[PDB]
Write a protein that binds this ligand. Structure first.
Ligand SMILES: Nc1ccn([C@@H]2O[C@H](COP(=O)(O)OP(=O)(O)O)[C@@H](O)[C@H]2O)c(=O)n1
Length: 202
């Protein structure tokens, strides 16, 4: 459209699929901020560094020129020209990404890469409408119960719901004050896409 749409929410709340669909429907890119955090975690694991060493990790990230490629069928992340995406939506990354996402310098690094992109676009994450694009014209926040979130994530991991839920509960972004809050347990994600688009297009 003109400017920026943010779609935030907890893990497996549906924000990823909804941002991709909304963006395609508006003919603009979507940016998955979490794919950059997943990349930072995956690189730190493979590099064999201590992720508590922020300086070394940033040198690694800054050095391999890690970049987000927004494609309409899905974002990709390249490191030194290698597409890392197929290694990022895995149990090992899910389990360690919080260690790196809490590092202030990692968040600054992800946010710099996001702020590089010219609007319009749809950006999805935890704090897109609060920390990174508080000026966004259209903000949405998708809530979901832990059960609904676990059930969804289990669909895409070797683990079953019982295990995913336990994991999610131990793992457990407030909404922006101006975000439309929608509970994806009560609306289907197809209904959510429609509803978010009706709002943006008003
Ligand atoms: N704006 C963001 C996005 C992701 N993250 C971290 O990156 C991880 C992966 O995000 P993701 O969007 O790819 O996956 P989900 O856990 O959100 O389903 C999150 O679980 C966050 O721990 C973050 O801290 N802030």
């Amino acid at each position: 459209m003109r400017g920026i749409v943010t779609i935030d929410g907890p893990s497996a709340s549906g924000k990823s699929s909804v941002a991709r669909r909304v963006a395609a429907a508006l003919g603009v890119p979507y940016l998955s901020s979490g794919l950059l955090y997943r990349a930072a975690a995956f690189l730190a694991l493979r590099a064999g560094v201590d992720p508590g060493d922020e300086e070394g990790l940033l040198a690694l990230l800054e050095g391999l020129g890690v970049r987000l490629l927004a494609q309409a069928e899905g974002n990709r992340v390249l490191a030194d020209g290698e597409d890392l995406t197929s290694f990022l939506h895995t149990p090992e990354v899910d389990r360690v990404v919080s260690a790196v996402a809490r590092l202030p310098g990692v968040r600054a690094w992800v946010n710099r890469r996001l702020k590089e992109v010219p609007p319009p676009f749809v950006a999805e994450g935890r704090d897109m409408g609060t920390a990174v694009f508080p000026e966004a014209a259209h903000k949405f926040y998708l809530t979901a119960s832990p059960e609904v979130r676990a059930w969804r994530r289990a669909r895409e991991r070797p683990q079953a719901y019982e295990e995913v839920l336990r994991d999610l509960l131990r793992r457990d972004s407030a909404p922006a004050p101006d975000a439309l809050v929608l509970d994806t347990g009560g609306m289907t994600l197809d209904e959510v896409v429609a509803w978010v688009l009706a709002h943006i297009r008003r």
